[PDB]
Amino acid sequence: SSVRDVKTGSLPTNFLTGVYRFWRSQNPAEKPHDPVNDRLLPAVVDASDKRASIGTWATTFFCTIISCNLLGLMPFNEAPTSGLGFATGLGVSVWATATILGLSKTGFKFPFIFVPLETISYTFRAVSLGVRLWVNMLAGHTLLHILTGMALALPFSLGFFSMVPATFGVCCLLSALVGLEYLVAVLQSGVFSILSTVYVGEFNHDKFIGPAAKIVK
Amino acid sequence: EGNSVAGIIKSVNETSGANLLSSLKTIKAQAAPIYPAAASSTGYSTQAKIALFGALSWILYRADGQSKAHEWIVDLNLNVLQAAWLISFSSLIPFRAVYFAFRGMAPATASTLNGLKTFSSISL
Amino acid sequence: EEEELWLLTLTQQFKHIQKHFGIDLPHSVVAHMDPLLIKKIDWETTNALEDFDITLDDMGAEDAKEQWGAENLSHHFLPLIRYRRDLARKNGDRYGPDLVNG
Amino acid sequence: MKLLPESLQQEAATAAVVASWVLWHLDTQLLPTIMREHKLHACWAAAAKRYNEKLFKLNPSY
Amino acid sequence: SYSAYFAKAGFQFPAGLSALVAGIVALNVCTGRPTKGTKEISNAEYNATPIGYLQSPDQHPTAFPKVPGMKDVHGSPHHHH
Amino acid sequence: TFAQRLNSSPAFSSFLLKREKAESEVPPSELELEAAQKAAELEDPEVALRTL
Amino acid sequence: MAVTSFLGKAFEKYFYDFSAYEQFGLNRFLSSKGQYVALRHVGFVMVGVNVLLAANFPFNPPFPTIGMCPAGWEGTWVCQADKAKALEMYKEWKKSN
Amino acid sequence: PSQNLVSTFANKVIVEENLVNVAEIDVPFWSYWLSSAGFTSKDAFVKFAEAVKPKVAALSTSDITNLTVAFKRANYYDKDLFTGIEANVSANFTKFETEQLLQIVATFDAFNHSSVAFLDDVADSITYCNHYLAPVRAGADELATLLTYYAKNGHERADLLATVARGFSEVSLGKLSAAQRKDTVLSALKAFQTFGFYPESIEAVIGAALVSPAEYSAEELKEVEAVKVAAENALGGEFVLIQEG
Amino acid sequence: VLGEVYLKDILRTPPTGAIPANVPHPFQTSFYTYATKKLIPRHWYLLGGFTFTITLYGILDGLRDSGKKKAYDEAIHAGKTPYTAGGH
């Protein structure tokens, strides 16, 4: 009932301001023909009422996936997005959000032999949006399990703290794959939300209402 | 709590001319804003103990099931590989350059406030 | 000293925001000092226009961006034009800017 | 390895609970705080030329 | 100035984290199925069986196994091969 | 100055910024230093009256 | 101590000015500090690998060895590639040892 | 005797005299939701209007909005209550949202009740204390009610009229049925010529009648084109309907 | 003069007694205001997409157990054990 007090200019407030303004920047509003004044202001407010909140949705999916992907790089923790139902469940849910948005631009009726081939390539982006997040979080972590099993075979067989130039070259290769996994954790949360603005932004187009009567000169 | 300019105006009006210039530092301090003083510490809040015991209850539970995972020595040596980058990030990230880089992501902190330019609001 | 309370409340309040904004000012002190600016900012978040200044920047509306900022601080002049209207009503006249042709 | 989960609907619903909490937390807790301090700065930077000129025309001190 | 006001309130969780943790726990306990490695039996079997025979060896792996596949319990020796 | 007000903010008492200085990123300008020093003289309102 | 206040002051002086890149000299051998941290990193892994193995050494490895054996074992339960075989051999070895 | 005991319980415990005895605690909650269920009951709204009069001076803004639109639907005009309501609005005008003030004015426009201090504190609140795009979220049948209430009472406030005329567009009039759009366009042009204020968005309320003139009569279109010529020289130009092409 | 009844609840100075409580947004106050003004008018496409996935993955969980029940019955009506006898 009593909300907490926020310092202005906090670092999480500055990061999320720049993050939100980035994903809002991906589907910008289109400039009308008329100058924007008090005549055109309800047409601009109604143009914003009919646009999807892709600025909010894409930073929902940025912040929920970069938090899940970076959990896999914390010790004692696995990424939730290395699960098949989690990662592909976010990809189908973006694709269904784009489709529900594109189906409502009409009256919820679904759109010769061409259109089964536009549909297939369109229905596969349900699969590809989530599987790309799942495979990247699985295939990077699986290779790290294999190469740290093979790196453990050397000090198990040889001495502890002995014949160290053999294990050093594979402990730096293991260390450089965890570092690549930090890059893939941030990139795949970016590629998921860049592509969510592209897919949802395809149906983010309505008619500008505008002035139907004008006193010229 | 009425406003402090009307407290300045009232408290300057009811002083004599002889003690005007002596009173001006106690009228200045009566209308200064409150900056609350550094209280007693009483550290680690009731929710900061849930956060630290709950993270220790999570780390012990995840290390418990990692140790019987059929690749337990491979799992437990991955926490060494993952915590090595948490150590190598405290020693390589420029934390003052990162603080001022996030500070420029927000337009509220990328510039100074801009209104009210002091020649428009004089009272002569 | 007739309207010195309003002109010096504007001066002292902005000088305290500017000294502390983006450094250590709490959000509670902003909403204390400027309650109707926070009220109008919260209207945009409630009514799904939280990116309205980004929308006017997308469509290049630089004069509607200046009107958006000016109409959100337009209550700063309300203690003056409620005072000057109660002067002119007490002196039998009409307030000037209230009228269309005046 | 582990590829399919024990329940796909339980993992899909964990994703929908986590992402709808982040949607609620952003819209309700974060973005009101973002916009309270973004738009104090933005309204002051957009009005500053017309605020000061309106105030110059109003105060009679000159 | 104002720095000592923000040190007074300490750590605090995000403002609705109790609904996230109650929502993730309610998905992990209201599964509507037995608890991953167990099977529902009748009460006549549950009251008749020792707790050493109710356990399976697969569900109790050894905490730091010297051989991969070591289990802590052995369960019912009455096998149906 | 601005960097001198940042140094006493809660951000620079945090652990990763505790040995840092805000002047190391963008130093205060020559006018910003001379106007913080001029504003120190005028925090005495008697000195501000006799100057004016 | 105050359990909150002492360790923060203790860890801070360990974190900030306690540097074994200078308290142990060590600029004589390494060029930068940017590659002292890239060897303390790999050094943390090799020490952490060698501690986790040695803290329980007589174990049959889950990971594939490449046909190599640790010490004078070579035919025992520690080197057995079949895991149901080595469980029977470990249970014989355990009552003797 | 099961039917006898229930019928005896029904004639002495569940009546409307005890329905108004539990409704004495919070009045504007129970006043608002009952009247939305069709409970007009003018003798019961007398009982409401006295148990709330020691409370109107300390009500929240959503309570005052709940009182007035309940006492509008119940059509019961309690004049010494309704001056306590306008003394809540005039004392707390900064806290009232213009979504709430457009429902309070439409009650005060039904029962022709106005102060001059109330007409300024509603116009000061819509213009200065509220967001300038909040007329755009209003719906033009409520804004036209506010325009006549300032023209009935002869209150010329040119700052309020520039604010309310923002909310008239093709968007806000298009959400109206053509019966309700007709009762609004004639009601908004009659107020815009009473003050002689012809904003640039009067061409959306004039143009709402000139695309579909077949629901308007001859003297109503004589009332429309009186305003159209009065606005063309004021805006310094010539009216032209746009057809989209 | 202009005398503080005109500045009331419009312009306040920085506080001198104590720092007040933060003013809540209407969404932080009640979930019902968030749900009816923003969650359902603006984000129902996203809630519809989360609903589609949970129902679709309940189809695929229903297909997977009807395929488990199919292969189970064709081992007990074939005189075989339906799994690999545990392993241990």
Ligand SMILES: [Zn+2]
């Ligand atoms: Zn792992």
